[PDB]
């Protein structure tokens, strides 16, 4: 299962 | 900047005339990812060739497997034709059942 949070550059 | 592809053409199982097998063309170590690969039978492009999902190695270079079912013979010649931005002309690698 993937990490469900995204963080932009 | 850019890395040219390494190319290997081989069969899934040991070659044996008359026996169905799988012809593979493994392209790896390239960057960027766009790449054109054709499998050839006696110089002509084989249709309905399939390939794996784009993946990459620890050094970030890409790799893909192109393959097609085939029944080898003594006369029929096979090869893999590859083009990439790093190649001025398509590179053709012939299948050698000993490689």
């Amino acid at each position: 299962e993937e990490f469900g949070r995204a963080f932009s550059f | 900047i850019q890395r040219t592809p390494k190319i290997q053409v081989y069969s899934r199982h040991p070659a044996e005339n008359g026996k169905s097998n799988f012809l593979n063309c493994y392209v790896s170590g390239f960057h960027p990812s766009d790449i054109e690969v054709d499998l050839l039978k006696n110089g002509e492009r084989i249709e309905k060739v399939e390939h794996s999902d784009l993946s990459f190695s620890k050094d970030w270079s890409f790799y893909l497997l192109y393959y097609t079912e085939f029944t080898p013979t003594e006369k029929d010649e096979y090869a893999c034709r590859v083009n990439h931005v790093t190649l001025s002309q398509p590179k053709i690698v012939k299948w050698d059942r000993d490689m």
């Binding site: - | 900047i1 784009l54 993946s55």
Partner: protein
């Protein structure tokens, strides 16, 4: 024995040919189990291995949403990278990410990973301590400052020590028939005369899994590293891999050469020789 789970992202811009393509592939060791392609007719996470198909409907909806959100996030990252590097909007660029965890036989976390690259070069990476970052340049340092300010490392650490190892543990159980089965290499040495003074001995390893393997040629008990042609391990297409190592030896001296094979599927390293 030891196992790993890794997710690989590739985001590629293509000015003039629509929005950047986003692809994700997930692996457990050398087995692909899930994929996502934003260029698909109906983009969604799709199973690529039998053992993952039993995951519930919520699993697939959550996984698909993560990827759809990522498609948008990475298109933004690509626009940001253009600014960070003072690049125009006319070229094609690529952002890649690989993250995941390694577990030992007991299933406990061995190491966590999270690394990003821009146009094939290292950009930023989570250090092994899972609390600090390593930026490759001043552009990545900009992202580092943002992630440090947002405590991103703390959030990833929580994931890597929990859900990552927990899900991998479940996948190993559900797919134990294959994921926990090592297939040893089938080996043989071929003899190919080059001239009247030298011949080629090729040591073959076929049908093995996982991909990790070691093939070496020795001459009178001495490794011939600098004198051995070793091709890259390649996929057979049936989950297994292939590899060979070759050395050019003087005619009549073939018996002074021995091939050595190491694979986790072998209870003991194997020694082979040309069998005329």
């Amino acid at each position: 024995g030891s196992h790993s789970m890794r997710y690989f992202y590739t985001a590629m811009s293509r000015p003039g040919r629509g929005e950047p393509r986003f692809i994700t592939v997930g692996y457990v060791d050398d087995t692909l189990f899930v994929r996502f392609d934003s260029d698909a007719t109906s983009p969604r996470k799709e199973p690529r291995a039998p053992w993952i198909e039993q995951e519930g409907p919520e699993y697939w909806d959550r996984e698909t949403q993560i990827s759809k959100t990522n498609t948008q996030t990475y298109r933004e990252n690509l626009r940001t990278a253009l600014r960070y590097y003072n690049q125009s909007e006319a070229g094609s660029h690529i952002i890649q990410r690989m993250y995941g965890c390694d577990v030992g036989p007991d299933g406990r976390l061995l190491r966590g990973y999270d690394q990003d690259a821009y146009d094939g070069k290292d950009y930023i990476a989570l250090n092994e301590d899972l609390s600090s970052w390593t930026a490759a340049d001043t552009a990545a340092q900009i992202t580092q400052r943002k992630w440090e300010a947002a405590r991103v490392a703390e959030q990833l650490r929580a994931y890597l020590e929990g859900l990552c190892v927990e899900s991998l543990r479940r996948y190993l159980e559900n797919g134990k028939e294959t994921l926990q089965r090592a297939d040893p290499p089938k080996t043989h040495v071929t003899h190919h005369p080059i001239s009247d003074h030298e011949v080629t001995l090729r040591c073959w390893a076929l049908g093995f899994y996982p991909a990790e393997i070691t093939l070496t040629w020795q001459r009178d008990g001495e490794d011939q590293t600098q004198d051995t042609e070793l091709v890259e391990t390649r996929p057979a297409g049936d989950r297994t891999f292939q590899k060979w190592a070759a050395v050019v030896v003087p005619s009549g001296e073939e018996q002074r050469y021995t091939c050595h094979v190491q694979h986790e599927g072998l209870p003991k390293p194997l020694t082979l020789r040309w069998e005329p």
